[PDB]
Amino acid sequence: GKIEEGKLVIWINGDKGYNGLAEVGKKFEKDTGIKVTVEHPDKLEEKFPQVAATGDGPDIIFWAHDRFGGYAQSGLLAEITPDKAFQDKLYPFTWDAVRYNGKLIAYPIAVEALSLIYNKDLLPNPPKTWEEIPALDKELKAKGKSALMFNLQEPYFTWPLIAADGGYAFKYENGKYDIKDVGVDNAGAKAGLTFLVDLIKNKHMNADTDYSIAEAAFNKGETAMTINGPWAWSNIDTSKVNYGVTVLPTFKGQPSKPFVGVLSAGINAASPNKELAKEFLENYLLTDEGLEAVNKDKPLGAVALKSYEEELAKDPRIAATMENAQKGEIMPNIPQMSAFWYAVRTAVINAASGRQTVDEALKDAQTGSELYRQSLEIISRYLREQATGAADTAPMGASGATSRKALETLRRVGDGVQRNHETAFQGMLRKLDIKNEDDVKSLSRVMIHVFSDGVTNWGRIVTLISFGAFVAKHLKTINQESCIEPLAESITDVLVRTKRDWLVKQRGWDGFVEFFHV
Ligand SMILES: CCc1c2c(nn1C)[C@@H](CCN1CCOCC1)OCCCCn1c(C(=O)O)c(CCCOc3cccc4cc(F)ccc34)c3ccc(Cl)c-2c31
Ligand SMILES: OC[C@H]1O[C@H](O[C@H]2[C@H](O)[C@@H](O)[C@@H](O)O[C@@H]2CO)[C@H](O)[C@@H](O)[C@@H]1O
Ligand SMILES: [Mg+2]
Numbered sequence: 086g087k088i089e090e091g092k093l094v095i096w097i098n099g100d101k102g103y104n105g106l107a108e109v110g111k112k113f114e115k116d117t118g119i120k121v122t123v124e125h126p127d128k129l130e131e132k133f134p135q136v137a138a139t140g141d142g143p144d145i146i147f148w149a150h151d152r153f154g155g156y157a158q159s160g161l162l163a164e165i166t167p168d169k170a171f172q173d174k175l176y177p178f179t180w181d182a183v184r185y186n187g188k189l190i191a192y193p194i195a196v197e198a199l200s201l202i203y204n205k206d207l208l209p210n211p212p213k214t215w216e217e218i219p220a221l222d223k224e225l226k227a228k229g230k231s232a233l234m235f236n237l238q239e240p241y242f243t244w245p246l247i248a249a250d251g252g253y254a255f256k257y258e259n260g261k262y263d264i265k266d267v268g269v270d271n272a273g274a275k276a277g278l279t280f281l282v283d284l285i286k287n288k289h290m291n292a293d294t295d296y297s298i299a300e301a302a303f304n305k306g307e308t309a310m311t312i313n314g315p316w317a318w319s320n321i322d323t324s325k326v327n328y329g330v331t332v333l334p335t336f337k338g339q340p341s342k343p344f345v346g347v348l349s350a351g352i353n354a355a356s357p358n359k360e361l362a363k364e365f366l367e368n369y370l371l372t373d374e375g376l377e378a379v380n381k382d383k384p385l386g387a388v389a390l391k392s393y394e395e396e397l398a399k400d401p402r403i404a405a406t407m408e409n410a411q412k413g414e415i416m417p418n419i420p421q422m423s424a425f426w427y428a429v430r431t432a433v434i435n436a437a438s439g440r441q442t443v444d445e446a447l448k449d450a451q452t453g454s455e456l457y458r459q460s461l462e463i464i465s466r467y468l469r470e471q472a473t474g475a476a477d478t479a480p481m482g483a484s485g486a487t488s489r490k491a492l493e494t495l496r497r498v499g500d501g502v503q504r505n506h507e508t509a510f511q512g513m514l515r516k517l518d519i520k521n522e523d524d525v526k527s528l529s530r531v532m533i534h535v536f537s538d539g540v541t542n543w544g545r546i547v548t549l550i551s552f553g554a555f556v557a558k559h560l561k562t563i564n565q566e567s568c569i570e571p572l573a574e575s576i577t578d579v580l581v582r583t584k585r586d587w588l589v590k591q592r593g594w595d596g597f598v599e600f601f602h603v
Pocket of ligand 3: 099125126127
């Protein structure tokens with residue numbers, strides 16, 4: 086449960102150039118005597134937050150930048166403080182992708198976007214539109230081939246099509262996100278996912294196709310096209326398929342919009358090797374020779390280092406990567422990105438398999454993506470109005486009827502719980518000795534341990550939130566009102582992390598209102 090001093094452990098995904106990264110590690114070891122271990126665990130982006138929360142895990146984690154905001158919000162990443170001379174060596178927009186709440190929380194490595202990859206011997210002119218792919222598949226099936234195979238198990242690969250006609254994750258306008266404006270179940274998202282499901286229904290695609298199946302079929306020449314990123318080009322090179330990399334097809338006349346990732350390297354906040362890690366990343370990896378070693382193993386895409394990016398910029402495959410990137414959007418790094426991806430992953434799999442209709446699947450994904458912010462709105466408002474005696478006048482915003490009605494239900498049932506359970510609430514408020522902001526941050530572990538043991542139902546959720554209001558009242562009297570919002574965030578985090586699937590099954594806070602109706 087403690088990271089070892091005097092070595093570096095690095096985690097990177099198994100589709101990236103980890104043997105090349107290990108070569109950089111060997112060069113580090115030659116200068117310093119410090120051994121560098123590169124590992125590629127399964128589901129490392131899910132494992133890192135669990136093990137790092139205990140003070141364990143790798144010294145350095147590599148992932149696309151979208152997951153790092155969550156890690157940073159949880160206190161799991163060291164702040165990065167490169168000097169100006171180093172910062173100036175990387176493109177400013179890559180640093181922007183690894184900024185969270187004003188601080189740099191990772192080193193950017195390379196810019197990744199999906200492209201259409203096609204077999205020039207089968208398909209001299211790849212299709213410009215998604216709509217022409219069914220007819221192309223029919224032509225190719227008559228030749229013992231198929232038009233298109235790509236990974237249908239990870240929503241990253243289907244998102245460019247879902248977004249094309251108007252789907253979006255979190256709305257971006259006037260230089261900032263509106264986290265409460267989620268675009269997963271609108272008409273444009275439905276149109277794109279319906280087109281995907283229709284491709285499967287019409288036998289142009291198979292719902293069970295995953296990364297390995299699609300890669301094998303393309304690299305053996307059975308399918309004329311795939312959708313993948315730069316890391317995949319190495320294995321196609323080895324297959325000697327005559328391939329090209331080009332712009333994704335349009336849908337309803339609009340570009341496919343891939344979510345653009347910046348592969349990034351974060352330092353574990355619990356690492357006793359932060360100076361070594363910074364030395365490795367700045368003076369070994371993020372150099373022309375270090376990125377070359379990784380890129381020669383599995384291509385990185387458009388690297389963040391200006392000097393080496395210019396050296397590779399003439400590669401037509403990189404130009405296509407950046408053309409598709411310009412038509413897409415840089416992913417947010419907000420902490421709810423993990424929940425968004427989990428919700429949309431399930432929606433695509435369920436729609437593709439027929440377990441849910443497109444309408445059902447996207448509705449559930451919308452609820453899952455909105456769950457944190459909607460829960461916080463309700464919980465923060467209830468705690469604050471209970472503590473101060475006066476309600477928040479600010480508009481509820483999106484799903485404001487749901488929030489207003491849930492808050493109204495909570496006012497009824499939560500005030501009764503606080504009345505009837507004053508005895509236990511007073512007793513618990515003594516055992517916990519909450520005096521300051523530091524005491525509040527300590528509550529999450531006891532909260533999780535009590536709340537995640539036993540039956541799940543709305544009554545216990547009312548008890549969780551009602552005791553929160555009881556504590557908010559206390560915080561107000563000891564002149565610690567500024568601790569109420571952090572407390573509300575902590576309660577919300579416990580609720581939505583421990584009860585995500587159950588909450589979505591109940592239709593979220595709409596199920597709460599109907600459970601307690603009349
Ligand atoms: C129902 C009220 C109640 C409870 C207790 N007894 N009784 C009668 C305490 C024993 C009480 N003894 C202990 C010895 O000093 C005399 C009283 O143990 C039983 C645990 C089950 C009942 N249960 C539940 C529940 O998950 O069901 C909760 C919500 C989950 C845990 O939330 C929190 C825990 C800790 C800090 C929190 C701070 C917050 F800001 C918000 C939630 C917090 C819950 C929350 C508070 C209480 Cl008091 C009870 C709860
Ligand atoms: O599928 C959801 C998934 O999308 C992205 O992960 C990409 C990753 O950025 C690429 O580097 C490559 O490894 O493929 C992954 C998809 O399998 C998000 O970065 C990730 O957080 C998200 O879960
Ligand atoms: Mg592995």
